[PDB]
Amino acid sequence: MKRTFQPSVLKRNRSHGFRARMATKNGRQVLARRRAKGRARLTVSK
Amino acid sequence: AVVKCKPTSPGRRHVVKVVNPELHKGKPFAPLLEKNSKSGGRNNNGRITTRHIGGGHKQAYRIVDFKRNKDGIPAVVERLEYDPNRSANIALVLYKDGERRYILAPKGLKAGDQIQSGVDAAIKPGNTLPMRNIPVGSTVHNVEMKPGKGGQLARSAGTYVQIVARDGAYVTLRLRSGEMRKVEADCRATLGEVGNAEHMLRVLGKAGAARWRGVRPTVRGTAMNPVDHPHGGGEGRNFGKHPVTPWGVQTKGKKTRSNKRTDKFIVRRRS
RNA sequence: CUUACCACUUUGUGAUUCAUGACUGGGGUGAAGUCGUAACAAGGUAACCGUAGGGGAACCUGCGGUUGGAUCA
RNA sequence: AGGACCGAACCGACUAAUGUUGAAAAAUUAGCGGAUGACUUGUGGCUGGGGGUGAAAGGCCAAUCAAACCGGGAGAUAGCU
RNA sequence: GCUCGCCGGAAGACCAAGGGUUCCUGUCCAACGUUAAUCGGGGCAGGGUGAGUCGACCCCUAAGGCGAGGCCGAAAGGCGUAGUCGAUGGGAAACAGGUUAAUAUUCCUGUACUUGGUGUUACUGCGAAGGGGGGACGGAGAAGGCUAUGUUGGCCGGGCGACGGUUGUCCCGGUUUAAGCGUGUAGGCUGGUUUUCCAGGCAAAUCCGGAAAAUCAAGGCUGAGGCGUGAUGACGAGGCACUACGGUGCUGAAGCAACAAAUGCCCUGCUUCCAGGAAAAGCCUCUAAGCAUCAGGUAACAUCAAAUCGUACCCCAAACCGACACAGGUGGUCAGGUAGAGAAUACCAAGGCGCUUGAGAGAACUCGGGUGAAGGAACUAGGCAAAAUGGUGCCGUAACUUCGGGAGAAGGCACGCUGAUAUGUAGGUGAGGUCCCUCGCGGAUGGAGCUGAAAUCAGUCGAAGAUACCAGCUGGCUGCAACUGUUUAUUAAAAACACAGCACUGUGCAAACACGAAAGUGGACGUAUACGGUGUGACGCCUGCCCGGUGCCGGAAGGUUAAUU
RNA sequence: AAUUCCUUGUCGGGUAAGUUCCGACCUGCACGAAUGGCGUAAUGAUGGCCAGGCUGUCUCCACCCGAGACUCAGUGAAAUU
RNA sequence: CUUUAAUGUUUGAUGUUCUAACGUUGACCCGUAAUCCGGGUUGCGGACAGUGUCUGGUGGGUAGUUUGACUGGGGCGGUCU
Numbered sequence A: 001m002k003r004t005f006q007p008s009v010l011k012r013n014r015s016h017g018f019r020a021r022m023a024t025k026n027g028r029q030v031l032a033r034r035r036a037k038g039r040a041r042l043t044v045s046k
Numbered sequence B: 001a002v003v004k005c006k007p008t009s010p011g012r013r014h015v016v017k018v019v020n021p022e023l024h025k026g027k028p029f030a031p032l033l034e035k036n037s038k039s040g041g042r043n044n045n046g047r048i049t050t051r052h053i054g055g056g057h058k059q060a061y062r063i064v065d066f067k068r069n070k071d072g073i074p075a076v077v078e079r080l081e082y083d084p085n086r087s088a089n090i091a092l093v094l095y096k097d098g099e100r101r102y103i104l105a106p107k108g109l110k111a112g113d114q115i116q117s118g119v120d121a122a123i124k125p126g127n128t129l130p131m132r133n134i135p136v137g138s139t140v141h142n143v144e145m146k147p148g149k150g151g152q153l154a155r156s157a158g159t160y161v162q163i164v165a166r167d168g169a170y171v172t173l174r175l176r177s178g179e180m181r182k183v184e185a186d187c188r189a190t191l192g193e194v195g196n197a198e199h200m201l202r203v204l205g206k207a208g209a210a211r212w213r214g215v216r217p218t219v220r221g222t223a224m225n226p227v228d229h230p231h232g233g234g235e236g237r238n239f240g241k242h243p244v245t246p247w248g249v250q251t252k253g254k255k256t257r258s259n260k261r262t263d264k265f266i267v268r269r270r271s
Numbered sequence C: 001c002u003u004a005c006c007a008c009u010u011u012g013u014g015a016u017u018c019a020u021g022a023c024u025g026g027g028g029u030g031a032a033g034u035c036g037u038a039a040c041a042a043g044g045u046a047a048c049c050g051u052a053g054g055g056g057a058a059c060c061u062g063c064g065g066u067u068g069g070a071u072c073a
Numbered sequence D: 001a002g003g004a005c006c007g008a009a010c011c012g013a014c015u016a017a018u019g020u021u022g023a024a025a026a027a028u029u030a031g032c033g034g035a036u037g038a039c040u041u042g043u044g045g046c047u048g049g050g051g052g053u054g055a056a057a058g059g060c061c062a063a064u065c066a067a068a069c070c071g072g073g074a075g076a077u078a079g080c081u
Numbered sequence E: 001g002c003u004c005g006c007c008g009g010a011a012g013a014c015c016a017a018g019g020g021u022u023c024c025u026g027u028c029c030a031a032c033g034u035u036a037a038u039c040g041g042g043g044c045a046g047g048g049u050g051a052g053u054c055g056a057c058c059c060c061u062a063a064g065g066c067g068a069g070g071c072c073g074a075a076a077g078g079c080g081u082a083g084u085c086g087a088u089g090g091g092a093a094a095c096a097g098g099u100u101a102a103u104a105u106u107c108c109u110g111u112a113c114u115u116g117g118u119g120u121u122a123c124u125g126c127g128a129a130g131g132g133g134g135g136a137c138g139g140a141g142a143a144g145g146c147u148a149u150g151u152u153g154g155c156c157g158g159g160c161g162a163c164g165g166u167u168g169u170c171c172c173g174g175u176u177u178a179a180g181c182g183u184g185u186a187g188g189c190u191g192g193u194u195u196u197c198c199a200g201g202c203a204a205a206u207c208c209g210g211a212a213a214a215u216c217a218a219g220g221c222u223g224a225g226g227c228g229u230g231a232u233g234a235c236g237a238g239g240c241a242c243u244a245c246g247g248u249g250c251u252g253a254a255g256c257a258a259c260a261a262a263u264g265c266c267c268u269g270c271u272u273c274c275a276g277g278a279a280a281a282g283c284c285u286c287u288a289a290g291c292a293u294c295a296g297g298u299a300a301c302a303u304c305a306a307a308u309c310g311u312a313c314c315c316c317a318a319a320c321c322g323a324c325a326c327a328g329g330u331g332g333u334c335a336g337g338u339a340g341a342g343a344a345u346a347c348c349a350a351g352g353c354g355c356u357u358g359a360g361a362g363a364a365c366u367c368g369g370g371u372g373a374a375g376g377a378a379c380u381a382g383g384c385a386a387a388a389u390g391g392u393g394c395c396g397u398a399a400c401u402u403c404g405g406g407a408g409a410a411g412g413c414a415c416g417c418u419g420a421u422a423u424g425u426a427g428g429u430g431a432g433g434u435c436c437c438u439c440g441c442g443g444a445u446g447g448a449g450c451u452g453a454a455a456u457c458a459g460u461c462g463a464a465g466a467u468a469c470c471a472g473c474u475g476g477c478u479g480c481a482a483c484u485g486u487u488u489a490u491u492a493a494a495a496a497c498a499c500a501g502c503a504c505u506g507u508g509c510a511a512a513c514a515c516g517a518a519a520g521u522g523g524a525c526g527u528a529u530a531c532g533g534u535g536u537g538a539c540g541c542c543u544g545c546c547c548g549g550u551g552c553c554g555g556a557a558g559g560u561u562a563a564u565u
Numbered sequence F: 001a002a003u004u005c006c007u008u009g010u011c012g013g014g015u016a017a018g019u020u021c022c023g024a025c026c027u028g029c030a031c032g033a034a035u036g037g038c039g040u041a042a043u044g045a046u047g048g049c050c051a052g053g054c055u056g057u058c059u060c061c062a063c064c065c066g067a068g069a070c071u072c073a074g075u076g077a078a079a080u081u
Numbered sequence G: 001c002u003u004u005a006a007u008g009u010u011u012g013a014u015g016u017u018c019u020a021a022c023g024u025u026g027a028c029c030c031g032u033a034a035u036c037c038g039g040g041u042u043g044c045g046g047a048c049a050g051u052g053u054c055u056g057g058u059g060g061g062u063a064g065u066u067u068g069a070c071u072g073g074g075g076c077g078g079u080c081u
């Protein structure tokens, strides 16, 4: 029945978005983490 | 009046309402209300602090004013209103100064009566007055913890306090809980018993009452598993343990009362 | 031929009545069994009425009332 | 009036049959319960792991729960196969 | 292209979420469509989403987040004032036709509207981060009025009919038309106005709140729809001319009335109830500092400005969530005809479809069904499953009971159609006429026409008339649990949890307690008729004896006793 | 008895026959008064027993209409080994 | 000088009274058109309360673990020198 994934751009971003990302200590670490690993799309860009 | 309820349907055959028709039927004095916002007994971190709490109706706070300054200036009880925030029955007033205010509204609160408040005032239900003035052994009313603090005693309905005695700057009174307390005396306290009094009759009836009243159900201890409550365990009710709060505390003994910074203003404890 | 009324008779569901039934409540009779002695004398705690509770049992005890109570109270 | 009655939408999930390499990692069909209420739903928010939440089953906490998931300590240890 | 069949409160139409070119045209068929494929949501190309008025920005704030300084904390950080963000909610304005292959309240026609700046004129006290009002708010129910819209008649166009009949009482179709402007009505609410005085609204205020008089009362807000104008316009059946055969140009009749309706509107109304029912800005008003021939304010009109993003298409699905072109999941809006209580249902309309393997054959057996002699639960753990029952009205209905119920108990009877009553009644609706008048969407009295149930008679066809779909099986004895509810998402819905009620116990407020190292915070803007914890679990009759052991409450004189000295 | 081991206790009722059911007795292995006792109208997709109607549940299956099953053509799996 | 009593003096035991640390989630003022914060004023309380170090009690709220072997399956029982 109802799956486990109900999309919502607004939420998707403010939840795992570069903004809310650069909002916490370990957040900017999560990024830098990828930035080091040379990730393609840092965190759900658009 | 209390008024029972016809067994018209289940969960209504027991209902025992309480109607005070003399209570305003329209909306409240808007310029004396201000949001409320339910809390659900949650903390600042969303962590539920006090169990059983939520739902209920909207509930908008009034104003009351347990201070009762506006001295010398009298006023006539404009109307009588119903208050969700408290058990008592709030009441308008309107001073001759032209300002409107609220009051718990005591026993004799007949709409149209007059009331004052001040060193002089007048020993009468409604008129606020500093015990340093009011007689001894009076029924009093909304007492005041500290001098001018705002009054926080006998606020509930049917409540009241007896000025047992006075000794200098302090006045020894008797709280409804049956405790011999003391106060700075220089604390306003008005007069008369708080209205309603017949409040302790509501039967509610159906569970909904409590629920839509802003109260969630309660889960018993010997009903849940160990990991969830000291009263855990199963396989056939059982117990063989000491009645303790969900944190291991004899809910039948102890006392917890550990202030020592107030004992001073205490004579005979609640018995 | 047909319709209407209606007898027998059919069905469902109550009411009343008599009989009857595992068992059981208490009530009546029964020479001589047991347990105690409550009442009639001041009956050995004066008795009884109503009422309430308690008790193997008569009964006891509490509350009010009555005299249909003994003494020279 | 009513946690009132019958009954769609709507919410739910008592029975049986079928499916069981399904149409489907719980559904389909014929019945079934609630249906102005402790109702039901959209949108956004707050509770973070020995912690949350729980009308209490150890139930839910992203198909995962008697302690989630991801990475690290880490080639844990494995008188066993 | 002609049939046939299926959906049609949808399997239709539009939209949000989400998707992100899937849209359209032309092409191509390898791989992708569970087949073939000339076809496609596939490949390759181009083309295609045009706004002052729709939405997002944008003002305003809710939850909640963030947070100068600040208060805390080994660090990281936690919290929070001012304040700043944050819609799912409040603030301003566009309608009707036409058009594209594909755009549409964006482009074209016509007819409007909002706000701001600048100007001309008339009049005037303007002036806030400030005061006041207003925005601005619950549940349920009960009407009436209105429209949507349907039905019928008229009117207009067309039609005389593959087979008996059909030019008059006949068949087919259409009958539409918005914003805005004026009117301000069914109805809802409320008495106005002047003057004076004042311990209130942090200052002030003419505003609001309070107090006096005086004077009139027909005042003042509000508000569906109707009616005009819009509109001699558009649209409009249909013809006439053309076609690449998809589709084109031109032309154009009638276009009214009655009745019936809504879950929509009047209605943020009205009545009533307890569980007592956002905030802030826009807005109106009042003053403050300031200004003080000024500036501004108000109205009329003229003019300029109205930026920028979004706008294709799917959207109960083959474009979203489910690995699939998957019988699952997915919020909002619209709501025709017959019959019906109705968004059930059955057949249909507009609209959309036949589900991307087909052709035969007519075996056992599996799956879904239809019917069965006689019997009728002998089946079986068990009546599992089936079968049965089913409607409206009326008659009538038990123990028991908390007097509400139990109760649709049970058990019956009538139901179609036709004529009469009555050429269509009772009712509903309400046109002239006529009366008068505050006075017109006036009132009265008229009852034409329109619409129209039930009943009672008599007759009549079938085996059967609640003929389909649809649509309770009933009763008796007894365990458990008061009852509605809740629960093991994916084997357990129960006798479990919960609940109203009860009792014990803690808590005097900086409460008890809980989250937190802390600051702080919930409890609660509550205060013992309150809040927490525990156990029991409606209600009725009740709830015995035990304090030795453990815990808990009170005492602490004495015995023993930590650090320390 | 949702508590009874012996246990299908015994007796009565229902039956043609009743280890279930209902009413009793008390010899309560091992009920009992808010980890409440006994009742209790109404309520229940709740447990047990019975009855009327009903019937393919069964005696005992038969016929019939469809979806596979089989034949043809296209595509074209799986477990296991 | 010792056995012992008034004076002073010292120091402990409690018990009052005081203010000046310390608290105030009383009332104002200012920072400030603020509810936090800070400073000031006043009132209340007041060396108490509270906290730090040390220390007795309590402490399944929490945490790390233990909880033997033989055994004609294991357990029970018995055994282990």
Ligand SMILES: NC[C@@H]1O[C@H](O[C@H]2[C@@H](O)[C@H](O[C@@H]3[C@@H](O)[C@H](N)C[C@H](N)[C@H]3O[C@H]3O[C@H](CO)[C@@H](O)[C@H](O)[C@H]3N)O[C@@H]2CO)[C@H](N)[C@@H](O)[C@@H]1O
Pocket: C029, C030
């Ligand atoms: N039957 C009379 C009622 O019951 C009771 O009376 C009954 C008993 O009390 C009384 O029984 C008595 C007994 O009390 C006394 N201590 C011993 C005496 N033998 C018994 O007597 C009884 O049993 C014997 C058997 O032997 C018979 O013969 C005799 O008739 C019979 N009455 O005999 C009566 C039975 O008939 C009340 N006391 C009386 O007031 C009441 O009205």
Ligand SMILES: [Mg+2]
Pocket: B223, B224, B225, B234
């Ligand atoms: Mg359990």
Ligand SMILES: [Mg+2]
Pocket: B226, B227, B229, B230, B232
């Ligand atoms: Mg525990």
Ligand SMILES: [Mg+2]
Pocket: B234
């Ligand atoms: Mg368990």
Ligand SMILES: [Mg+2]
Pocket: C037, C038, C043
């Ligand atoms: Mg005697």
Ligand SMILES: [Mg+2]
Pocket: none
């Ligand atoms: Mg006596």
Ligand SMILES: [Mg+2]
Pocket: D004
């Ligand atoms: Mg209901």
Ligand SMILES: [Mg+2]
Pocket: none
């Ligand atoms: Mg179903």
Ligand SMILES: [Mg+2]
Pocket: D007, D035
């Ligand atoms: Mg229902």
Ligand SMILES: [Mg+2]
Pocket: none
């Ligand atoms: Mg959500």
Ligand SMILES: [Mg+2]
Pocket: none
């Ligand atoms: Mg899961």
Ligand SMILES: [Mg+2]
Pocket: D073
């Ligand atoms: Mg290591």
Ligand SMILES: [Mg+2]
Pocket: D075
């Ligand atoms: Mg390894």
Ligand SMILES: [Mg+2]
Pocket: none
């Ligand atoms: Mg593409």
Ligand SMILES: [Mg+2]
Pocket: none
């Ligand atoms: Mg296409």
Ligand SMILES: [Mg+2]
Pocket: none
């Ligand atoms: Mg394509």
